[PDB]
Amino acid sequence: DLKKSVQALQNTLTELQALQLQTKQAHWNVSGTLWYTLHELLQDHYEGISKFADDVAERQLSVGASSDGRAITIVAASRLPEIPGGFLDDAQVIQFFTYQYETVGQRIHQRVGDVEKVDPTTANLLQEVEHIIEKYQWQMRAFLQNTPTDPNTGFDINNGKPV
Amino acid sequence: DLKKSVQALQNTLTELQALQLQTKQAHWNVSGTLWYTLHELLQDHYEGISKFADDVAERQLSVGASSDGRAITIVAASRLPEIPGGFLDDAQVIQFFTYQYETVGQRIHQRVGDVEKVDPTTANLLQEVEHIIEKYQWQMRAFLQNTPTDPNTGFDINNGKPV
Amino acid sequence: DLKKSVQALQNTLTELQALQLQTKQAHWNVSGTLWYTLHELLQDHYEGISKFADDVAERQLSVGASSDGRAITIVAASRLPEIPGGFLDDAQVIQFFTYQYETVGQRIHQRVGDVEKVDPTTANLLQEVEHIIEKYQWQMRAFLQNTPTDPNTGFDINNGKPV
Amino acid sequence: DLKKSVQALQNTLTELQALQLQTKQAHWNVSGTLWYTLHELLQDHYEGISKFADDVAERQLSVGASSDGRAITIVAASRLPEIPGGFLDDAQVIQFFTYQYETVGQRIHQRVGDVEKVDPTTANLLQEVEHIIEKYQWQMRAFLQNTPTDPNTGFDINNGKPV
Amino acid sequence: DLKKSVQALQNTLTELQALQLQTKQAHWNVSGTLWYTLHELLQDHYEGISKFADDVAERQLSVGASSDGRAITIVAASRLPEIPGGFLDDAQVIQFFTYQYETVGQRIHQRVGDVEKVDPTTANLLQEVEHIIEKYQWQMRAFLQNTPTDPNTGFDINNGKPV
Amino acid sequence: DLKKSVQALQNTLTELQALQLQTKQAHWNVSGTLWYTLHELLQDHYEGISKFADDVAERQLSVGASSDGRAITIVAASRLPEIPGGFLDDAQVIQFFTYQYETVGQRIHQRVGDVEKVDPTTANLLQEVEHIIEKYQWQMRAFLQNTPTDPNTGFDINNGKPV
Amino acid sequence: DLKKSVQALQNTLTELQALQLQTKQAHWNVSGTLWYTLHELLQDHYEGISKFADDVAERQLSVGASSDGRAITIVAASRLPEIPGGFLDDAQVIQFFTYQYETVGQRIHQRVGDVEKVDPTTANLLQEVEHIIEKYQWQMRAFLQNTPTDPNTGFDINNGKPV
Amino acid sequence: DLKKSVQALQNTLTELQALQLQTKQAHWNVSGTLWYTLHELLQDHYEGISKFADDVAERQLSVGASSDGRAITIVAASRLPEIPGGFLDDAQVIQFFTYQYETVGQRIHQRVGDVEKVDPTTANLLQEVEHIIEKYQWQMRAFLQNTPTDPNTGFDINNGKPV
Amino acid sequence: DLKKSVQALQNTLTELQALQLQTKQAHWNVSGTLWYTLHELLQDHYEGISKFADDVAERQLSVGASSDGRAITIVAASRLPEIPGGFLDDAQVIQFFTYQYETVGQRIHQRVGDVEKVDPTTANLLQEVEHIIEKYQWQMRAFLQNTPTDPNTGFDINNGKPV
Amino acid sequence: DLKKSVQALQNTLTELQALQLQTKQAHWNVSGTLWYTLHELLQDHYEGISKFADDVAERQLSVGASSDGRAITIVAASRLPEIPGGFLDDAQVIQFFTYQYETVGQRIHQRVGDVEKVDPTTANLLQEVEHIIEKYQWQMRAFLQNTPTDPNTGFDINNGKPV
Amino acid sequence: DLKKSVQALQNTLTELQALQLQTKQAHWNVSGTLWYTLHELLQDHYEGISKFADDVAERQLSVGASSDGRAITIVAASRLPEIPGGFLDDAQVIQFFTYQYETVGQRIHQRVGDVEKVDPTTANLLQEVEHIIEKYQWQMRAFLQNTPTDPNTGFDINNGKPV
Amino acid sequence: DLKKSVQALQNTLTELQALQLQTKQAHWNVSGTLWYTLHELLQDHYEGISKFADDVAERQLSVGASSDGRAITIVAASRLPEIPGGFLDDAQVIQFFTYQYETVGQRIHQRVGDVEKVDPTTANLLQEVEHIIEKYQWQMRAFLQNTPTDPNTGFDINNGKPV
Ligand SMILES: [Ca+2]
Ligand SMILES: [Ca+2]
Ligand SMILES: [Ca+2]
Ligand SMILES: [Ca+2]
Ligand SMILES: [Ca+2]
Ligand SMILES: [Ca+2]
Ligand SMILES: [Ca+2]
Ligand SMILES: [Ca+2]
Ligand SMILES: [Ca+2]
Ligand SMILES: [Ca+2]
Ligand SMILES: [Ca+2]
Ligand SMILES: [Ca+2]
Ligand SMILES: [Ca+2]
Ligand SMILES: [Ca+2]
Ligand SMILES: [Ca+2]
Ligand SMILES: [Ca+2]
Ligand SMILES: [Ca+2]
Ligand SMILES: [Ca+2]
Ligand SMILES: [Ca+2]
Ligand SMILES: [Ca+2]
Ligand SMILES: [Fe+3]
Ligand SMILES: [Fe+3]
Ligand SMILES: [Fe+3]
Ligand SMILES: [Fe+3]
Ligand SMILES: [Fe+3]
Ligand SMILES: [Fe+3]
Ligand SMILES: [Fe+3]
Ligand SMILES: [Fe+3]
Ligand SMILES: [Fe+3]
Ligand SMILES: [Fe+3]
Ligand SMILES: [Fe+3]
Ligand SMILES: [Fe+3]
């Protein structure tokens, strides 16, 4: 089934390209106490996402199908919220990608089982994408991770209010 | 005039981001005799465009204004044709970016004079973007450049028909 | 079942070693308009094939079995056509490896399922070999890939005749 | 007018050397929640400032005039406040360089127009210095940049009081 | 099942950390004819084990669970013999890690199937750990590997007695 | 006195190995606002500690005595508190290593004088270890260093309570 | 005979300097289907020619004689046709250097025997120059090399006419 | 005006190519006390001149015009004295390039204003060439720069006679 | 005589390709006390042999003749014994390549004189191949080299029997 | 005694910062026959001085005290002559740093004994600073070092008068 | 006392230069089972010895005294046995440097106390030389280090006789 | 004739080792105006001489003969003057190596013809040694090379007297 692997590959590529533009957008406009920390972290996320975005589209051509990474396709086949414009707060960026990475990781997790029987090599690549996406999810989640000595509500980065 | 420099910077960033996704799209789906030549050349163009896309948005924040590099903004503030989907021919890719680079370079050329008096530092960056865009225009134009011994109609890469 | 993993590993190693000598042979004797393009591309294919040839034989020793990479074994356990001698045409090289990579990739695809239950780690390596082989198949296939504006018959690289 | 370019070059060099010693001073003595973040950021600012300090003095010798980068000249031709001694707070460092970079950038902006007609090459260098200084100004300003979801008063890094 | 992946990941991490300290211990105290050969080989094993020890604990945090790599946990959740103290003989080091790598590799092999259905991405990482552990097992086993012309009893490295 | 230098070297090695596992443990499980800052800082501390851990054990073999870096020895010859398990708060990590580095540095300071007369070369190495340990102590202490404009109580990273 | 080695060395240097300016000239002005392929290939030829141009003149000074690499000497001691000006066709560039490299290689081949008896070290250098020149001749000749399946007349790169 | 930018670009390229061959000529044949100092300095000048020679010709093709870097053009469009042949004295080399760099820098300075209105991007490149040429002029001028304690007549490098 | 240089070049290439597959075969299957020592040494030999195998075939194309490096040609134009299959003993590997390198070096030594008069450049390359082959012969011969204090019979690596 | 180590560390840092600005000042304005030789040598001295200036201030924070590297402190806690302004002669620069390095080295030599008992680790760093300062003193002293065949009065670099 | 530091420095330099030529001599002529192991190990020892040989002589010039590293001085101020000529056995090389490194290390240990009071910086360098020499002593001693399971008599590398 | 190649190789190695110690000796003790210039130049000569010293001895072992690079052999098989001790003048160093390099180069030139018939590969290496030795001879000779505008008597570096 070539159509099945294309669906899993093309859907993953569009999500990676969406995260590509969103990580870079927050990379430039993040503000607050953790602006520079997230500035550097989002650039590393961008480079890891961009690398796998190349691999996914390369895998699309490898199985004999075209790759659609156009701007209209990113907006069209959205299915994910768009990052807000203007200056972004550090606490807002942390909460945005905490949910975005988790949502993308869960979708990739399902696509792995959809193609594991017909295309284990493509499923191997999708597992590697799920690995880096869930790792990035942890790196955003750890900012507000509860500990025995501190719930880490994020009040210090959100004008005194829990995030 | 902060509004003038933002207009020149934001308009250039959106065009660079459009070329970013278009060079990479042709990078993966180009086909024909010159597919691998353009594959490598488009990746170099992508890296040069991406680097200046970072500098332009960085200059936006440097003058005190937010940067809009979101996917919807690329589609919204288009003003440039979209690259076709599916498998792309090498002759089609050459002619697409020959006109696209030239159109972008002419617009950047006008923005340089619009901000040279109020923001010479930003105009200095826009000149550097115009330099790399017009250089890429030559690199696409040279495929069909007429010579005394050969008009270079591109018939060999376009099913026997002049491009 | 140690015998099953050895069969899949040893058969893949011999095919990689055959492609090793064939890519390098075409690397030196390719001729025509695309001689230098294929010269560089075949060297990259050679380096990727050689690296995985090391990994496959290393995996053979890791599971406790000897590795047979001798010259007589490459000729003996052939099951693949031999590249022609003498000066090779660029269109001939493109069509040779288009079919050779596809044939090798299909065989590796079958070996993955043969060992996925008894040796998932070896199957993981075979998936990585299938990934690079099918990627190389695309890189040879793209020279003659049909497009909406051009069928890309390869007449320009084959003395006016469709390849 | 050689005297005009020397004035713009020598005044810029002294300001860069002042920022050189001030960024490094805060680099070692910064304290608080953002001490290590600023520690790394100030070292990058120091390296960029030092590089352009070399270029400015090199340009001075290139136009045929001596370069005065002595310690007494930094103190003499001050015209900028001195960074406080002892342990420095992170919020204090952020506010110090937010104003210092902006003041230096505005002065360099004026010097560009003073020499653009008689020495466009020197004005080109001064534009590059203004670029990196205003970029560093943004990197300090972003710590307290107001956002729709958070004014970012810096209370968390200033003992509960808005910075 | 989060508990299942944590069990496989945490158990593998403790075994890797045990091999970490054991390879380094033998790295410093190995003696005999093959002391320097094993000195270098054990350092390479240490670097490969340490890298995957980072990946395993990183995967633990990625799936949302804490990582226990404390010294007491290495001793507590032992289940593997401790390397002897004092000066170690080369033949003793070869036989120690021949069995240790094999025991660890067999356990990781079982954990792959335990989590392959619920967490294929984690199973993908465990397969990579099993790959490097079984490769290191071969590198220790080859010192005493029987050949048609020599049984390789190791008498030369064990005071004239077969190892 | 060989026994004196062994005592100073072996005791320092065990403390370095304890800090090795503790910095890496906090490196993976740190949480809160400063989780990523400490994540990077603890990895640099880990690399510096690991390098000197190699030098100390190498010096042990150089003076003619075995090196004991086994896991049981780290737990046995403890004399330092164990880092807590589970998710660690950033303020908890800062206070843990502030005291741990200081305690280790004071012990190494005493060992330098114990061996300076009989083994100045070993004392030279112990001085280098004390240098990097006290430097790391400052890097943890600076998070809560009092300043004229801010006492830096750490309330922002400790749920509103002074650390 | 110092005069004999100077003649062989000085004549080779002038030919290398002529090829230096000619490869770079075609590097910038080549046009057609193979413009970018030759653009890259001519830059590699330029770097290899320039390196040996340094070695030849260095050998001239080593044997105790001055080196004449002036522009007038390149034009004066020509004895080779000049590359045409303006935009150059890819087929024209291929045929120009196919004959130019061959002519230079044959002359260097004769100079090797002229100095092999009196200056074997200089003859050793001239052999290395002949090696790289004849290698470059093959790299230009392979574009039109006849094959059993294709004569490679170059009609596709020469407006339908055999080159 | 395309003709205006071509004139400024082509005239600068020929002067750079002339300095290219002249710096390298003096690089090999310089003699005296400062032969090795100038040997190294002239090689650095050669690399900087060669790099900008590439950029100038690349800019020529970017604006849509051919580039003439042939040997006959260097001799034809001379307008600069030729470096003497044979062994060159260090004092002679210093005085030759002191005037040559200054003459070239003054001409480039005039071309910047000739094209600043019609082609600011090309004028930006010409400013960068003027920067490196005037920097090299200082590096040659400093050998004989008068000081309060020493006029630096160069008598020590010119057989006792002031240069 | 083109036929003479082709004979010397083609015969050397086939021998290098035979040693290529044989060094790599022993690289993977060597066993015994010196397995890892030879494992590393054979990989270095493989890289040196492979590099000169490229140069020899490149020289074949440079003189205008095709290069035959196919697998069947390695087996056909053998004239050298084949390395045994299965697990190889370290003493067996040492004795195999001691004779193999010597036999290849003697043949290359004869080919140098066969082509030194008609093709000194090719003879220069064959001398470089003889240099690396005879160097590798020494590196295998030194394992059993007799010394005044020890005949080095290899009994320790050959089950107590002299090799 | 914390006050003792601070005195030795702070006094050394100010002297290093003074040499920092003085080496760089002479680096840009040195003139005469040895201008370029000293230009390069002073840049190497600057990099070595700057590196130890970082280490000294880092050691200050490591022992728990603030670091004062401000411009006013360099001028205030002077105790060393200031380098002259304007163009500097090479002989003047050589004699300036010959005495300056020696004076700084003697002071650091005394501080080593002042803190060797209370702070051997800090004394270890001060010894390393004395090492590089006395090495730089030799590198300036060697220009006028007397030899059996030449007193090296420096008349050639000082307008015919002994330095 | 300048004479005291010169004595310790000059005596150490001559011993390092003696070990320099001896390690390299054994590096080329070592034979037996461990020839290649010692070949690599002796090259690393040579590089470490050569580096400190540079530092010692550099320290000699730094304190104001000439450095005598001539060949006659190595033979004259010998006081160490000369390595035998001809082919050297591996067991002979191991025993030669086991005693040579120990003898050199003991002498350097005494020189440290001779100059620690008058020249602590030089004593610091001599401690670093003693560190690397005693480390190399361990690396040679470990070949015959006794273990609980094996006395490691070296019979396997010494024709069946204990070394 | 093995004895002939050994004679040429061993004699060249001893001369290279003599120049090794002499270049390094002058590298440390050179004095005068050109001390630092020669300091750097002699270090480059040392590295080139040392590299070929390794190749020569490696070639000795490759042809089956031992290599004698001991200190006594350098003094014994001298046949070259010894460099003077103590502080060396720059003019003395220039004249010493001008004659030393020339004498060594002439001897190597004769050895090439002595072994060219029996050992062309060894003669190829000796030609490469003669190349670097005669190049170094030029680099020392150029300091006093006569020019049309200056005889370059070296009076400025030799207390007013011609060298
Ligand atoms: Ca898998
Ligand atoms: Ca994988
Ligand atoms: Ca906030
Ligand atoms: Ca400008
Ligand atoms: Ca610029
Ligand atoms: Ca086409
Ligand atoms: Ca063809
Ligand atoms: Ca604060
Ligand atoms: Ca043993
Ligand atoms: Ca917290
Ligand atoms: Ca054409
Ligand atoms: Ca002169
Ligand atoms: Ca054996
Ligand atoms: Ca002077
Ligand atoms: Ca000390
Ligand atoms: Ca030290
Ligand atoms: Ca032996
Ligand atoms: Ca030859
Ligand atoms: Ca050669
Ligand atoms: Ca002198
Ligand atoms: Fe790609
Ligand atoms: Fe950025
Ligand atoms: Fe391998
Ligand atoms: Fe500089
Ligand atoms: Fe990590
Ligand atoms: Fe180690
Ligand atoms: Fe050169
Ligand atoms: Fe170029
Ligand atoms: Fe090749
Ligand atoms: Fe620092
Ligand atoms: Fe040195
Ligand atoms: Fe060697």
Rounded to the nearest 10 degrees, the angle between the axes of helix E35-62 and helix I35-62 is 80
For chains G and I, tell me whether 3 or more CB atom pairs sit within 8 A of each other. yes
Cβ-based burial of A128 (10 A; exposed 0-12, middle 13-18, buried ≥19) = middle
Say whether A1 counts as a known binding-site residue: no
Q: Which residues of D are annotated as a binding site for Fe cation?
A: 27, 54, 58
CA of B79 to the centre of ligand 21 (A): 27
Between CA J116 and CA J122 the distance in angstroms is: 8
For chain F, list residues whose CB is within 8 angstroms of any CB belonging to chain A. Answer: 30-33, 35-37, 39, 84, 86-92, 156-160
Taking the CA of D93 as reference, the closest ligand is 8
Contact A17, A69 (CB under 8 A): yes
Q: Which residues of J touch K121 (CB under 8 A)?
A: 109, 112, 127-128, 130-131, 134
Dihedral sign (CA B69, B72, B75, B79): negative
Q: Where are the domains of chain I?
A: 1-163
Largest CA distance in chain J: 54
CA distance to partner chain C, nearest, from residue B26 (Å):
12
Contact flag L70-K58 (C-beta cutoff 8 Å): no
Q: Collapsing DSSP states into helix, strand and coil, what is residue C1?
A: coil
CA terminus-to-terminus distance, chain H: 45
Supply φ then ψ for residue B147, to 5 degrees. Answer: -130, 160
For chain H, list residues whose CB is within 8 angstroms of any CB belonging to chain J. Answer: 33-34, 37, 41, 139, 142-143, 145-157
How many CB atoms lie under 10 A from the CB of residue A96?
Answer: 18
For chain A, list residues whose CB is within 8 angstroms of any CB belonging to chain E. Answer: 109, 112-113, 116, 123-124, 127-128, 130-131, 134-135, 137-138, 141-142
- Least Cα distance to E71 among F9, F67, F20, F90 occurs for F20
Contact B132, G11 (CB under 8 A): no
Contact flag D156-A87 (C-beta cutoff 8 Å): no
**Nearest residue on chain G to L124, alpha-carbon basis:** G124
For chain H, list residues whose CB is within 8 angstroms of any CB belonging to chain L. Answer: 30-33, 35-37, 39, 84, 86-92, 156-160
Between CA E15 and CA E74 the distance in angstroms is: 8
Between CA H96 and CA H99 the distance in angstroms is: 6
From the centroid of its chain, how far is CA H76?
17
Instruction: Record the tokens describing residue E68, joined without a space.
Output: 């226990």
CA of L149 to the centre of ligand 17 (A): 66
For chain G, list residues whose CB is within 8 angstroms of any CB belonging to chain B. Answer: 30-33, 35-37, 39, 84, 86-92, 156-160
Contact flag F66-E29 (C-beta cutoff 8 Å): yes
Tally C-beta pairs within 8 A across G and L. 31
* Resolution of the PDB structure in angstroms: 2.2
For chains D and G, tell me whether 3 or more CB atom pairs sit within 8 A of each other. no
Contact F132, F153 (CB under 8 A): no
Contact J107, J15 (CB under 8 A): yes
How many CB atoms lie under 10 A from the CB of residue A42?
Answer: 24
Q: Which helix (H) or strand (E) holds J104?
A: helix J90-115
| Exposure of E77 in the CB half-sphere (CA atoms within 13 A) | 16
Tally C-beta pairs within 8 A across E and K. 61
Q: Mutate which of K62, K119, K122, K128 to test chain J, going by most J C-beta atoms within 10 A?
A: K62
Q: Collapsing DSSP states into helix, strand and coil, what is residue B133?
A: helix
| Nearest CB neighbour to G121, from listed L127, L137, L138 | L127
The amino acid present at D112, given as its one-letter code, is V
Between CA A85 and CA E64 the distance in angstroms is: 30
Contact flag B155-G158 (C-beta cutoff 8 Å): no
Contact flag F159-A150 (C-beta cutoff 8 Å): yes
Taking the CA of J131 as reference, the closest ligand is 16
DSSP label of L116: T
SS3 sequence, E37-103? Answer: HHHHHHHHHHHHHHHHHHHHHHHHHHCCCCCCCCHHHHHHCCCCCCCCCCCEEHHHHHHHHHHHHHH
Residues in chain E: 163
CA of L150 to the centre of ligand 12 (A): 5
| Nearest CB neighbour to D67, from listed J28, J61, J70 | J28
Q: Which residues of D touch F151 (CB under 8 A)?
A: 159
Between CA B98 and CA B134 the distance in angstroms is: 10
Q: Mutate which of I145, I153, I155, I159 to test chain K, going by most K C-beta atoms within 10 A?
A: I145
Dihedral sign (CA I148, I153, I154, I159): negative
Q: Which residues of I touch C57 (CB under 8 A)?
A: 28
Between CA K52 and CA K15 the distance in angstroms is: 11
Q: Which residues of G are annotated as a binding site for Fe cation?
A: 27, 54, 58
Cβ-based burial of B47 (10 A; exposed 0-12, middle 13-18, buried ≥19) = exposed
- Least Cα distance to I55 among G98, G44, G135 occurs for G135
Instruction: Record the tokens describing residue I150, joined without a space.
Output: 């020890």
Between CA F114 and CA F40 the distance in angstroms is: 35
Between CA H45 and CA H26 the distance in angstroms is: 11
Between CA D63 and CA L61 the distance in angstroms is: 60
**Nearest residue on chain G to B41, alpha-carbon basis:** G36
How many CB atoms lie under 10 A from the CB of residue C18?
Answer: 24
Supply φ then ψ for residue L89, to 5 degrees. Answer: -80, 150
Residue F79 zone, left/alpha/beta (φ > 0; ψ -120 to 50; rest): left
How many CB atoms lie under 10 A from the CB of residue G79?
Answer: 11
Say whether L58 counts as a known binding-site residue: yes
DSSP label of G30: E
DSSP label of D82: P
**Nearest residue on chain F to J65, alpha-carbon basis:** F138
The amino acid present at I58, given as its one-letter code, is E
The amino acid present at B5, given as its one-letter code, is S
Residue-by-residue DSSP string for G44-113? HHHHHHHHHHHHHHHHHHHTT------HHHHHHT--SPPPP-SSEEHHHHHHHHHHHHHHHHHHHHHHHH
CA of J106 to the centre of ligand 28 (A): 55
I89 CB-near residues (< 8 Å, 6+ apart): E147, E148, E149, E150, E152, I30, I31, I32, I157, I158
Q: Which residues of B touch D141 (CB under 8 A)?
A: 64
The amino acid present at K116, given as its one-letter code, is E
Contact A24, B69 (CB under 8 A): yes
Cβ-based burial of I103 (10 A; exposed 0-12, middle 13-18, buried ≥19) = middle
Contact H18, H73 (CB under 8 A): no
